[PDB]
Amino acid sequence: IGLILETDEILNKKLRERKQEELQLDYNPSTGQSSVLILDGGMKAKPYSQISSFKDLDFKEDIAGFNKSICLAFGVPQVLIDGGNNANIRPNIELFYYMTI
Amino acid sequence: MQIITAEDYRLYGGLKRPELESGVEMMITAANALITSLLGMDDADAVDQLINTKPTRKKYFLSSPSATSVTKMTINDKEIDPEQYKLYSDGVILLKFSPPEGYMDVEYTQGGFNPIPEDLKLAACMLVDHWHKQDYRQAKTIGGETVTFNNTKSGIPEHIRTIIEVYRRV
Amino acid sequence: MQIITAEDYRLYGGLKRPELESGVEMMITAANALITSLLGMDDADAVDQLINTKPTRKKYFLSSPSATSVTKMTINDKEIDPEQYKLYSDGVILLKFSPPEGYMDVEYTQGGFNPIPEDLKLAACMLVDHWHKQDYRQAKTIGGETVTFNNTKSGIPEHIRTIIEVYRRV
Amino acid sequence: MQIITAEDYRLYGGLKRPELESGVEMMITAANALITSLLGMDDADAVDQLINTKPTRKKYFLSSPSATSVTKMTINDKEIDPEQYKLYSDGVILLKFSPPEGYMDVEYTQGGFNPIPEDLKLAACMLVDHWHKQDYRQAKTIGGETVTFNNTKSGIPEHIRTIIEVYRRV
Amino acid sequence: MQIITAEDYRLYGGLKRPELESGVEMMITAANALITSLLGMDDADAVDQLINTKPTRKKYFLSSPSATSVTKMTINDKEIDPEQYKLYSDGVILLKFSPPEGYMDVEYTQGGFNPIPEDLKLAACMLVDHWHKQDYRQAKTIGGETVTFNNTKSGIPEHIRTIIEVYRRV
Amino acid sequence: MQIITAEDYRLYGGLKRPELESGVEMMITAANALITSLLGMDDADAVDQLINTKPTRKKYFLSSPSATSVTKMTINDKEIDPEQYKLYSDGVILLKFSPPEGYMDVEYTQGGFNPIPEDLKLAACMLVDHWHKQDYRQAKTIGGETVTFNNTKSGIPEHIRTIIEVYRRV
Numbered sequence: 001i002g003l004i005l006e007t008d009e010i011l012n013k014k015l016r017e018r019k020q021e022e023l024q025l026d027y028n029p030s031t032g033q034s035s036v037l038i039l040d041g042g043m044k045a046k047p048y049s050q051i052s053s054f055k056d057l058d059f060k061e062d063i064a065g066f067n068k069s070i071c072l073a074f075g076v077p078q079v080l081i082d083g084g085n086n087a088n089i090r091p092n093i094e095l096f097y098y099m100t101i
Numbered sequence: 102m103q104i105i106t107a108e109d110y111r112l113y114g115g116l117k118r119p120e121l122e123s124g125v126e127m128m129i130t131a132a133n134a135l136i137t138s139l140l141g142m143d144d145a146d147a148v149d150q151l152i153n154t155k156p157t158r159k160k161y162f163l164s165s166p167s168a169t170s171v172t173k174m175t176i177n178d179k180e181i182d183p184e185q186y187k188l189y190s191d192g193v194i195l196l197k198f199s200p201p202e203g204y205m206d207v208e209y210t211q212g213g214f215n216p217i218p219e220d221l222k223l224a225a226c227m228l229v230d231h232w233h234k235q236d237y238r239q240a241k242t243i244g245g246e247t248v249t250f251n252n253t254k255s256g257i258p259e260h261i262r263t264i265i266e267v268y269r270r271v
Numbered sequence: 272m273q274i275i276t277a278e279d280y281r282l283y284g285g286l287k288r289p290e291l292e293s294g295v296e297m298m299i300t301a302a303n304a305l306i307t308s309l310l311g312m313d314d315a316d317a318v319d320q321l322i323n324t325k326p327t328r329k330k331y332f333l334s335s336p337s338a339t340s341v342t343k344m345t346i347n348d349k350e351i352d353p354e355q356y357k358l359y360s361d362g363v364i365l366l367k368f369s370p371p372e373g374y375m376d377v378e379y380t381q382g383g384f385n386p387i388p389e390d391l392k393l394a395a396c397m398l399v400d401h402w403h404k405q406d407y408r409q410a411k412t413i414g415g416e417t418v419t420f421n422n423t424k425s426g427i428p429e430h431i432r433t434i435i436e437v438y439r440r441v
Numbered sequence: 442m443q444i445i446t447a448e449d450y451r452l453y454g455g456l457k458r459p460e461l462e463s464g465v466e467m468m469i470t471a472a473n474a475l476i477t478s479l480l481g482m483d484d485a486d487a488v489d490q491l492i493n494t495k496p497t498r499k500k501y502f503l504s505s506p507s508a509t510s511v512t513k514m515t516i517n518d519k520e521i522d523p524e525q526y527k528l529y530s531d532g533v534i535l536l537k538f539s540p541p542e543g544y545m546d547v548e549y550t551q552g553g554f555n556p557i558p559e560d561l562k563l564a565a566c567m568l569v570d571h572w573h574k575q576d577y578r579q580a581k582t583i584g585g586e587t588v589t590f591n592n593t594k595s596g597i598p599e600h601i602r603t604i605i606e607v608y609r610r611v
Numbered sequence: 612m613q614i615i616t617a618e619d620y621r622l623y624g625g626l627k628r629p630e631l632e633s634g635v636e637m638m639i640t641a642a643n644a645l646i647t648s649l650l651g652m653d654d655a656d657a658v659d660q661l662i663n664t665k666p667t668r669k670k671y672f673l674s675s676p677s678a679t680s681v682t683k684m685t686i687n688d689k690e691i692d693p694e695q696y697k698l699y700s701d702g703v704i705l706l707k708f709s710p711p712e713g714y715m716d717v718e719y720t721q722g723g724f725n726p727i728p729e730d731l732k733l734a735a736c737m738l739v740d741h742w743h744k745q746d747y748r749q750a751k752t753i754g755g756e757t758v759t760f761n762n763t764k765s766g767i768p769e770h771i772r773t774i775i776e777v778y779r780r781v
Numbered sequence: 782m783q784i785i786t787a788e789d790y791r792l793y794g795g796l797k798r799p800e801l802e803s804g805v806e807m808m809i810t811a812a813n814a815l816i817t818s819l820l821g822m823d824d825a826d827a828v829d830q831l832i833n834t835k836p837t838r839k840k841y842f843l844s845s846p847s848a849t850s851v852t853k854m855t856i857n858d859k860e861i862d863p864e865q866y867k868l869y870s871d872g873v874i875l876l877k878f879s880p881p882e883g884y885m886d887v888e889y890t891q892g893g894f895n896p897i898p899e900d901l902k903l904a905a906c907m908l909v910d911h912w913h914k915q916d917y918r919q920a921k922t923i924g925g926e927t928v929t930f931n932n933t934k935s936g937i938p939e940h941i942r943t944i945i946e947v948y949r950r951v
Contacts (some may be wrong), residue, residue, distance in 0.1 A: 112293040112412065113293065113294060113297055114294075115292060115293060116295060182420065184392065187424055189319070189321060190319065193321070194375070195321075213359075219297065219300040219301040219303075219304050220301045220304045220305045220308070222297075222301070223297060223301040242305055245412075245413075245414070246411070246412060246413045246414070247410070247411070247412040248410065248411050248412075249408060249409040249410045250409070251407055251408065251409070252406065252409075254426075258407070259407070259423065259426040260407035261428040262426055263371050263425060263427060264305065267306075267308050267309060
């Protein structure tokens with residue numbers, strides 16, 4: 001939601017819908033220029049907040065754990081999934097070959 | 102714009118005096134103009150409007166949704182032709198081409214209500230009564246009877262304002 | 272739209288005067304229009320609507336849920352045929368294909384209530400009484416008797432508003 | 442739907458006038474419809490409903506818990522057969538297979554109350570009295586006696602609303 | 612369910628008119644049903660309930676704590692036998708095995724109060740009086756005497772509500 | 782449980798009518814039950830209770846502190862013997878061994894007050910008077926005299942509630 005406006009009056013539905021589309025196209029900087037808004041006749045702007053946010057879906061470590069489990073069940077080092085430095089890479093191939101295969 | 106004239110008020114009131122006093126006739130003439138104006142209409146026939154336009158945008162809203170026909174439109178004083186757009190109800194124009202950025206200048210005829218709805222005609226009669234009886238008070242007690250008046254809103258008596266708001270544009 | 276006419280009010284009131292005064296008949300004519308409008312209906316027969324559409328979306332809602340039949344629909348002025356959609360109650364159209372992005376233009380006939388429910392017919396009678404007796408006041412004390420009126424809401428008397436809200440669209 | 446008719450009100454009131462006035466009979470006819478509607482029931486016999494469905498979900502709730510039998514159901518216009526589901530009270534359907542994702546379309550017959558409970562029948566009588574005596578006021582003092590009326594809620598007199606809410610669906 | 616009938620009210624009131632008016636008898640019939648329903652009981656004899664179940668959980672609560680005997684239970688339409696569970700008071704079933712995950716379907720007979728307690732019988736009489744004397748008002752002053760009524764709660768007169776809440780289930 | 786009977790009220794009131802009216806005798810019978818219940822006692826003789834138990838914990842509290850003797854106790858349906866615990870006043874059992882984890886099931890006889898204290902007997906008489914004189918009002922002015930009633934709390938008149946709370950369990 002971008003904005004909430006509120007009244008105790010009853011408003012003509014067709015004109016209300018038109019007004020919503022005018023405000024939406026005018027205020028966005030991509031579409032339109034206008035930015036100040038003047039309310040009259042008692043329309044009130046209602047403050048609100050994002051009651052549930054994408055920020056709380058910090059899955060990132062849990063899925064990483066599952067990837068490690070899968071990678072571990074076969075027994076392939078992560079350096080082979082990434083590629084690292086030389087000192088990492090050349091011994092890890094021998095690790096993978098000798099221990100697993 | 103005339104929402105009522107003397108005969109409409111005479112029917113509503115049931116008046117049988119042979120004529121209105123100048124008070125009532127002036128109040129009728131003011132009431133027409135005020136209700137004309139609180140709706141946000143105006144009594145002009147042809148209107149000229151200047152609109153900021155951008156190539157990202159091709160719906161444009163005319164300033165008065167009763168607009169009945171566009172009669173010229175031009176961009177940066179380059180004229181464009183009626184095949185290049187479509188005009189829909191409530192004064193919506195849809196461009197069939199993405200416009201050059203800058204100012205659009207458009208002429209249109211704005212029409213109005215037809216016929217005037219009976220609820221506006223009533224609300225006008227109630228406003229004329231409101232001024233005529235001088236009911237802009239909180240109470241009166243002449244003799245023994247006594248009355249308390251509405252909790253008026255925007256200074257407009259509350260029982261009138263609902264009918265205005267059912268039509269109040271924007 | 273007529274929710275009541277003179278005979279309906281005459282039955283409700285039990286009036287035996289041979290005719291209504293012009294006051295009552297005008298108030299009936301305004302009451303029909305106001306209750307028509309506060310419900311958010313309108314008295315048009317054929318309606319034209321323009322809808323923004325996206326390929327991700329294939330349910331679309333018509334502007335008036337009493338819509339009884341779509342009679343043309345087109346996208347970007349490319350016409351499409353009645354096999355390519357299905358029309359359900361409350362004015363829901365379900366597309367059977369994912370649409371090209373852009374504007375959809377549709378014509379439909381909007382019908383209405385039938386038959387008019389008896390509760391609306393009563394509420395209209397109570398509104399006509401409300402204006403006719405001039406009960407837009409907070410109190411009166413003519414003679415000895417005395418009354419205090421409802422705590423009106425949106426300026427509509429509270430005992431009327433429940434019946435409107437039971438039908439008030441959206 | 443009839444919760445009361447003239448004989449029920451005549452029993453409640455103890456009326457011995459030979460007939461009701463048209464006022465009372467209209468108020469009874471409106472009261473049936475209003476109480477029908479405030480409960481959130483409707484008077485349709487066969488109902489059609491469209492439901493969004495997902496393979497993760499196999500309980501689905503019908504729109505009216507008095508639904509007595511499903512008579513068609515289909516998914517993406519692929520019909521499915523009565524062995525593939527079970528229908529429980531309060532309009533709960535349990536699928537015995539995990540559905541393809543998309544829209545489900547179902548027809549069912551919605552039944553109603555039977556028999557109409559005596560408390561609704563009383564509440565209807567009290568509502569008819571409420572409109573008939575015009576007890577939508579805050580006080581009256583005709584002559585010497587004097588009364589103050591209920592603190593009405595949702596505009597419905599408080600002593601009625603408890604009986605509605607004991608049944609008000611959802 | 613009958614908490615009172617005409618003889619119970621006749622004893623409470625001390626009435627010596629030879630018969631009740633239809634008003635009182637209808638109000639008694641409604642009062643039985645309303646108090647039946649505000650307690651959250653119902654008058655069904657056999658009840659069917661569907662419960663979500665998980666292997667971690669083996670106490671399950673029946674929907675009505677007066678349940679007197681389970682008469683079928685099944686999981687995923689696999690039936691299980693009365694040695695595999697124990698049924699305790701207030702409708703608690705304890706499984707003696709950890710269940711397969713999914714839906715449990717159970718039939719039981721729900722019984723009720725016996726005998727009906729004297730406090731409910733009184734509260735019903737006071738409710739019948741409340742409607743009969745029309746004491747749903749805030750004040751009255753007929754003649755010289757004058758009274759002010761209770762601060763009702765949930766629209767139920769406060770002096771009644773305590774007795775309901777002492778039994779109000781859940 | 783009887784806190785008062787007719788002779789106790791007759792002594793308190795000083796009544797010399799030869800008999801009570803059925804009103805007073807019903808109110809006495811209800812008053813016994815209500816005061817029984819607001820204290821949180823009940824009139825059962827033998828009680829069965831199921832307790833969650835853990836090896837870390839060996840004090841357990843019985844559900845009713847007037848419990849006079851445990852008559853069976855068992856854990857996981859393994860019975861245990863009266864040497865393995867001690868039972869103290871206010872229904873406290875102390876285990877002399879650390880229990881296996883799980884559910885304990887115990888039977889005990891709950892006794893009660895003896896003798897009934899004179900303050901409860903008085904409070905019951907005052908409650909019977911409260912209902913009998915219909916003093917559930919805020920004021921009365923019959924004739925010239927006038928009274929204003931207590932600021933009741935939990936709907937119980939304030940001058941009664943202190944005596945209840947001096948005994949109200951938990």
